[PDB]
Design an enzyme around this catalytic site. Structure first.
Site, PDB file in Angstrom:
ATOM      1  N   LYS A   1     -15.249  -7.269  -2.209  1.00 40.05           N
ATOM      2  CA  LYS A   1     -16.648  -7.097  -2.563  1.00 40.05           C
ATOM      3  C   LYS A   1     -17.331  -6.005  -1.756  1.00 40.05           C
ATOM      4  CE  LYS A   1     -17.954 -10.901   0.400  1.00 40.05           C
ATOM      5  NZ  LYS A   1     -16.538 -11.166   0.748  1.00 40.05           N
TER       6      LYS A   1
ATOM      7  N   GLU B   1     -22.617  -7.356   8.370  1.00 42.74           N
ATOM      8  CA  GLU B   1     -21.314  -6.801   8.053  1.00 42.74           C
ATOM      9  C   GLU B   1     -20.800  -6.002   9.244  1.00 42.74           C
ATOM     10  OE1 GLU B   1     -18.618  -6.569   5.690  1.00 42.74           O
ATOM     11  OE2 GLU B   1     -19.492  -8.574   5.880  1.00 42.74           O
ATOM     12  N   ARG B   2     -19.706  -5.275   9.057  1.00 43.50           N
ATOM     13  CA  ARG B   2     -19.101  -4.557  10.169  1.00 43.50           C
ATOM     14  C   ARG B   2     -19.889  -3.299  10.508  1.00 43.50           C
ATOM     15  NH1 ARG B   2     -15.434  -6.029   6.311  1.00 43.50           N
ATOM     16  NH2 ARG B   2     -13.754  -7.442   6.947  1.00 43.50           N
TER      17      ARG B   2
HETATM   18  N1  ADP Z   1     -10.311  -1.853  -5.876  1.00 40.91           N
HETATM   19  C1  ADP Z   1      -9.386  -2.005  -4.903  1.00 40.91           C
HETATM   20  N2  ADP Z   1      -8.259  -1.267  -4.881  1.00 40.91           N
HETATM   21  C2  ADP Z   1      -7.334  -1.421  -3.919  1.00 40.91           C
HETATM   22  N3  ADP Z   1      -7.444  -2.306  -2.917  1.00 40.91           N
HETATM   23  C3  ADP Z   1      -8.520  -3.114  -2.825  1.00 40.91           C
HETATM   24  C4  ADP Z   1      -9.575  -3.003  -3.837  1.00 40.91           C
HETATM   25  N4  ADP Z   1     -10.520  -3.899  -3.521  1.00 40.91           N
HETATM   26  C5  ADP Z   1     -10.105  -4.525  -2.399  1.00 40.91           C
HETATM   27  N5  ADP Z   1      -8.919  -4.059  -1.982  1.00 40.91           N
HETATM   28  C6  ADP Z   1      -8.190  -4.536  -0.789  1.00 40.91           C
HETATM   29  O1  ADP Z   1      -8.765  -5.777  -0.391  1.00 40.91           O
HETATM   30  C7  ADP Z   1      -9.401  -5.692   0.881  1.00 40.91           C
HETATM   31  C8  ADP Z   1     -10.862  -6.058   0.694  1.00 40.91           C
HETATM   32  O2  ADP Z   1     -11.637  -5.699   1.824  1.00 40.91           O
HETATM   33  P1  ADP Z   1     -13.225  -5.615   1.664  1.00 40.91           P
HETATM   34  O3  ADP Z   1     -13.500  -4.557   0.637  1.00 40.91           O
HETATM   35  O4  ADP Z   1     -13.806  -5.496   3.045  1.00 40.91           O
HETATM   36  O5  ADP Z   1     -13.606  -7.028   1.002  1.00 40.91           O
HETATM   37  P2  ADP Z   1     -14.420  -8.177   1.774  1.00 40.91           P
HETATM   38  O6  ADP Z   1     -15.703  -7.516   2.196  1.00 40.91           O
HETATM   39  O7  ADP Z   1     -14.600  -9.239   0.727  1.00 40.91           O
HETATM   40  O8  ADP Z   1     -13.514  -8.583   2.904  1.00 40.91           O
HETATM   41  C9  ADP Z   1      -9.237  -4.273   1.378  1.00 40.91           C
HETATM   42  O9  ADP Z   1      -8.546  -4.309   2.623  1.00 40.91           O
HETATM   43  C10 ADP Z   1      -8.403  -3.557   0.342  1.00 40.91           C
HETATM   44  O10 ADP Z   1      -7.123  -3.236   0.880  1.00 40.91           O
HETATM   45 MG    MG Z   2     -17.133  -6.754   3.889  1.00 42.39          MG
END
Ligand code: ADP
Ligand code: MG
Ligand code: ATP
Ligand code: ATP
Ligand code: MG
Ligand code: MG
Lengths: 438, 114, 383, 380
Positions: free
Chosen positions: A157, A183-184
């Protein structure tokens, strides 16, 4: 000199009680503590009686003594709002944290506003195309509506909201306000460098041509700062909506952290806890926050809010309360991500008010409902296929399983913001291509 | 730091205050000098509705209550134990504990004459 | 420590008077030195001891009744809920930021009441009775209590008249009656508001066809919903013409917890006018599981002990005394009816929740909306 | 009837007898002879039990300040209340009595940081336990530092080589990153962590001094025997020259297990702030959340999910946001965190697991099925 000056009575974590002998501040009025290592702003939350208010500190309270002079500011937390906030990063109390000088304030607004009234509601269901296949097909986003990205810590997300920033905010004509709540800090620095590089944030003399305001209350901050930084982001967005008359984008990463910060400070305010451990005032605090984000008659806010589900539990009260505030939920799932499908949107759990045949046309609606019917018929067969195999299915159901395994790979899509760690280039997909494909 | 032993043990937060009052009055040989002062302050709460307002009204500040109690007892011919007790009970709004400190002090006193 | 010597102390036993005649002439010149720090004493008015999170603890207010409307000096109204021995616990009908310690609280003399009558027919109202549609105050209307006891055994009669809803799954399989409480229950986004809305639209389509006494006046109570949804519903009911027979009571999510707690009772009191004057009413308590949540917050901040999922113990009585007001009266009471459509949102299809099982045990019928029937094309997703 | 209002008293300040006894014993004409209760910078213990001491007085103590009991055990002023101070004891509370004198130290809770910490085994408060005397070339800094902001950071560019083939190929880890090592018990999490430390020793002799990595190993809730075996390993591999070890074992008090990650993080934040590179491993950060849950439930705070407190996310976000890559106007140093979370039966949807997943940058899922099929390291 003794007037309008209380002293600290007791320090319980982020909760400070201040005894005003002369005259008590109002609730939500901001105070300032004299002689601290940082600027410690308290916000009055309760009147406890015996000439004592109970406050919530916007910074850390380590170093507070129970005799410290506390000055009533006579006002709530006032932050700088205006076009001079564009291209600047500011914290919960409006201080510029980007080391670019003071923020040229068009005005200073209180961060506590009443929600816009019932007569100032705009009911215009217009679509907002994002280029994401599952979003544009199964739960399309309203142009001036509230959007939720429900997720379970690692499902994507933040990648989805970065792709929505990449796809929507470039095609948009107004101003964006990114509110980083809990968040971070590395993510805030990455977004700042990407927005400086892509040109939507300009530094120095050309700062007036920047189209984004960042408001950052990240997870290194105490729970008083994470509880009110969404209100600062709302104030900066509401100045552009109300006074400037603009159409605003407002991306709020982890609106759950507002609720979690209120539940953190609520145990020390002396309340009896509600269900699974949250504050009793979850629904009314979330409502008083989310009803300020409204497309009114004098301006529109397209709000995309990431919501975090705590232990992949959608029945947890803080996302379950958030579900009733949004026009389009995009529930991301852990199992869809474990299949390798990205974005991991649950097709049979994401909904929108725009999926109606009279607003998006009957062809798009019938295609979305047919795709949902095939996916639901496959989800009904998930137990027979597991414990018996596909060889015992009917000939009409093996076709259903084949078409559903085709449409659930076809909902996945590469992202322009995910190309740095995946290697494949991103794909923007038009709406007619999605309907024609499905 | 050496205090004389009370004749009998008693309850909490309004009987141990009277136990301490008896313990510091027996050090100054001042038991019957403060017992009638307790009774006199009971009669004073009977007399004025503005002196029992300090015990019951929660809107008077603790500064105003302590400044009434201190500036009313300007040595008043009275014991210093009574004056250092009532400005201590006025610092918490615990002036309503006087009418049970008197009961436990009566219990200690008639236990003092066996 | 017992009360007998504690009552013996009421008899004077001072035996000396060397402080009494000294400080009695010293008390009044001491008190007059601080008379600008004194607030004036309070008996039949009130004064705020402590205010926070929508609860005011009010000193004084000697002759308030339980459940009585009070009014703070800043104009915001209240409701005296638990009358304790030294203070009154007042819930605030609005934002409690305008209330301070030491603010005067005024008893209004009235138990909480809303305007009922034909003047509400067409207005968009808050949970307390004030119109929020921006069309001026309520005219041709009268005040009535929100805590009317439901009609008993001798006042009712048997439910015979249909009140069709226009949804043929409902009208074929789960047939409603005109004085019947029917629960629409399901998960989120499974079509419960759609069933209630189509019922209201069908009453608009039937009210222009029947002779003046089978006409059905809808009342929609929106508890805890956002204001955009309520505005979209008002736009729908005006663009189809259903707002001529519909009242809308709207305590949104931005409102206080007692406003959302009280809005189903306000809507039921507005709908009881048609039931008591021989007409036929239809009341929809949308999101009754949000009124229970508002009641939970309101009672937890009054420091009442929590129970199942931290709900109050009397959260069954909250919905039972609300839903039992939907009746079909006898011919000597007019023969008027009121049919309830409460809505409960479940979590992941868990029907065994506390509020869900309570309202299932209260209402007559059930309308279950499964989220797997919804995605299989079956709309409405009637289980 | 005029005394019916006073027939039962109702007041605040549960320690009312203390405020009456601080007024009544100087009413005795004998005990104005320097018989004062010290209440400005000193304080008497009211209550002590389950690791929380309630302390009268201390009217000038700061919130979060390290106080010192007369027994020698230190504490922390956590709850400054109107009539007492809630002190959290940093040791065995059996040596504290009612009426003990509590002295304030004048300083927020601090540990020694600097180049004198390298090679030394430490408890969760800063004092060494390896028996090699006090810390010499060192200075005290706070354990509770706000993390560096947005301008203070830069993007992670340089690689931190773990030395593990499965890690350095498939999940590459840069300097300034936070990488969760998550898996069941006995799946090889500590093995990856100590391979990282040994490989930092192996690479430190071949780089210049501005590119060396100084390691901190925080052992929270471990056995003292495994900490001793790990000290023998880091001594016999030469890795103790660049390694600090903080050790709050299972026998230590739960405030020490709560504070040992912050102590080790300050000891590594020295290296981050002075332009050098740090690598910190919080081994079994789940045990720190268990110790914090113990401290919260003994403080009668209302528990949330899995009986954890509401600020158990804040507990780990405070700790892990201090691992950053600093900008060029802050020295350019970095700190790399390796938090370790143990899961039960491979449930990574747990509360503390999903909290640290939503804090850290990546994950190292160590599967329990591949670890018993000989595939070691069992990287999922
Ligand atoms: N559209 C995408 N394509 C490839 N990898 C994804 C995608 N969305 C999420 N990921 C993988 O999933 C993880 C989600 O991290 P993040 O975006 O910070 O989600 P959250 O904030 O829910 O933890 C990332 O480390 C990434 O490797
Ligand atoms: Mg996040
Ligand atoms: N009979 C129907 N045919 C087609 N679509 C329908 C039907 N009924 C409901 N829907 C769709 O289902 C969605 C959810 O509808 P509705 O708001 O009635 O459910 P809800 O349970 O009230 O949702 P929430 O729980 O969010 O309040 C709407 O977007 C609507 O378009
Ligand atoms: N790569 C490897 N090759 C061979 N053996 C290994 C490897 N990694 C670990 N082991 C062995 O397997 C066991 C794993 O212990 P280790 O401490 O690494 O796991 P852990 O997850 O920390 O367990 P715990 O948390 O219970 O201490 C050790 O006895 C170690 O000797
Ligand atoms: Mg609904
Ligand atoms: Mg280990």
């Amino acid at each position: 000199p003794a007037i309008d000056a209380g002293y600290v009575s007791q320090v319980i974590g982020p909760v400070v009680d201040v005894r005003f002998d002369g005259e008590l501040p109002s609730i939500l009025s901001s105070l300032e503590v004299e002689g601290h290592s940082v600027r410690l702003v308290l916000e009055v939350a309760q009147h406890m009686g015996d000439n004592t208010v109970r406050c919530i500190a916007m910074d850390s309270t380590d170093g507070l003594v129970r005799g410290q002079k506390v000055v009533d500011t006579g006002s709530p937390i006032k932050v700088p709002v205006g076009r001079g906030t564009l291209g600047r990063i500011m914290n919960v109390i409006g201080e510029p944290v980007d080391e670019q000088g003071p923020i040229d304030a068009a005005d200073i607004w209180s961060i506590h506003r009443e929600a816009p009234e019932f007569t100032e509601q705009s009911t215009e269901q217009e679509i907002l195309v994002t280029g994401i296949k599952v979003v544009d097909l199964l739960a399309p986003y309203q142009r001036g509506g509230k959007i939720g990205l429900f997720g379970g810590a690692g499902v994507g997300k933040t990648v989805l909201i970065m792709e929505l920033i990449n796809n929507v905010a470039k095609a948009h004509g107004g101003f964006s306000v990114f509110a980083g709540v809990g968040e971070r800090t590395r993510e805030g620095n990455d977004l700042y460098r990407e927005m400086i590089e892509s040109g939507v944030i300009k530094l120095g003399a050309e700062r007036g041509n920047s189209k984004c305001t960042l408001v950052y209350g990240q997870m290194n901050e105490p729970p008083g700062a994470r509880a009110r930084v969404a209100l600062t982001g709302l104030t900066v967005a509401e100045y552009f909506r109300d006074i400037e008359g603009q159409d605003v984008l407002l991306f709020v990463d982890n609106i759950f952290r507002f609720t979690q910060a209120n539940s953190e400070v609520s145990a020390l305010l002396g309340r009896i806890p509600s269900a699974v451990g949250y504050q009793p005032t979850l629904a009314t605090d979330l409502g008083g926050l989310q009803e300020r984000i409204t497309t009114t008659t004098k301006g529109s806010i397209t709000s995309v809010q990431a919501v975090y589900v705590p232990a992949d539990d959608l029945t947890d009260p803080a996302p379950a309360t958030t579900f009733a505030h949004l026009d389009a939920t995009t529930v991301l799932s852990r199992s869809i991500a474990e299949l390798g499908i990205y974005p991991a949107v649950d097709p049979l759990d994401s909904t929108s008010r725009m999926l109606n045949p009279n607003v998006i046309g009957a062809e798009h609606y019938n295609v979305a409902r047919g795709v949902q019917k095939v996916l639901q018929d496959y989800k009904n067969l998930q137990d027979i296929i597991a414990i018996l195999g596909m060889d015992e299915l009917s000939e009409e159901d093996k076709l259903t399983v084949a078409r559903a395994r085709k449409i659930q790979r076809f909902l996945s899509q590469p992202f322009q913001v995910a190309e740095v760690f995946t290697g494949t280039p991103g794909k923007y997909v038009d709406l007619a291509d999605t309907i024609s494909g499905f | 730091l050496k205090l004389p032993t009370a004749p009998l043990q008693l309850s909490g937060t309004s009987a141990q205050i009277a136990t301490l009052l008896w313990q510091v009055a027996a050090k100054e040989n001042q038991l019957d000098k403060v017992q009638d002062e307790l009774y006199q302050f009971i009669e004073l709460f009977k007399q004025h509705s503005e002196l029992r307002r300090l015990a019951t009204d929660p809107f008077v500040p603790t500064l105003v209550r302590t400044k009434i109690i201190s500036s009313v007892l300007k040595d008043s011919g009275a014991s210093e134990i009574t004056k250092k007790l009532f400005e201590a009970l006025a610092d918490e709004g615990a002036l309503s504990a006087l009418l049970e400190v008197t009961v436990n002090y009566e219990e200690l006193m008639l236990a003092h004459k066996k | 420590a017992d009360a007998k010597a504690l009552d013996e102390l009421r008899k004077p036993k001072f035996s000396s008077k060397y402080l009494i005649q000294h400080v009695s002439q010293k008390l009044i010149p001491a008190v007059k030195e601080w008379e600008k720090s004194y607030q004036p004493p309070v008996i039949h008015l009130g004064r705020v001891l402590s205010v926070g999170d929508g609860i005011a603890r009010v000193y004084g207010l000697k002759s308030v009744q339980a459940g009585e409307l009070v009014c703070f000096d800043s104009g915001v109204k209240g409701m005296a809920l638990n009358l304790q021995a030294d203070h009154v616990g007042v819930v605030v009908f609005g934002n409690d930021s305008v209330i301070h310690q030491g603010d005067l609280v005024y008893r209004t003399g009235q138990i909480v009441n809303v305007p009922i009558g034909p003047g509400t027919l067409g207005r968009v109202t808050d949970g307390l009775g004030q119109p929020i549609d921006g069309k001026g105050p309520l005219t041709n209307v009268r005040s009535s209590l929100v805590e009317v006891k439901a009609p008993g055994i001798i006042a009712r009669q048997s439910v015979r008249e249909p009140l069709f809803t226009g949804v043929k799954a409902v009208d074929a399989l789960v047939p409603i009656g005109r004085g019947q409480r029917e629960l629409i229950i399901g998960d989120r986004q499974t079509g419960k508001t759609a069933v209630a809305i189509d019922a209201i639209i069908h009453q608009k389509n039937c009210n222009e066809q029947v002779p003046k006494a089978q006409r059905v006046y809808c009342v929609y109570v929106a508890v805890g919903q956002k204001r955009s949804t309520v505005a979209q519903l008002v736009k729908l009911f005006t663009q189809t013409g259903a707002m001529r027979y519909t009242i809308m009571v709207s305590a949104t999510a931005s409102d206080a917890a007692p406003l959302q707690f009280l809005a189903p009772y306000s809507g039921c009191a507005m709908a009881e006018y048609f039931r008591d004057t021989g007409k036929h009413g239809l009341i929809i308590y949308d999101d009754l599981s949000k009124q229970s949540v508002a009641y939970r917050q309101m009672s937890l901040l009054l420091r009442r002990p929590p129970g199942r999922e931290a709900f109050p113990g009397d959260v069954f009585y909250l919905h039972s005394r609300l839903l039992e007001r939907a009746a079909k009266l006898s011919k000597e009471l007019g023969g008027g009816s009121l049919t309830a459509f409460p809505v409960i949102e479940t979590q992941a299809g868990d029907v065994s929740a506390y509020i869900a099982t309570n309202v299932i045990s209260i209402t007559d019928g059930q309308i279950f909306l499964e989220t797997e029937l919804f995605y299989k094309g079956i709309r409405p997703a009637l289980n």
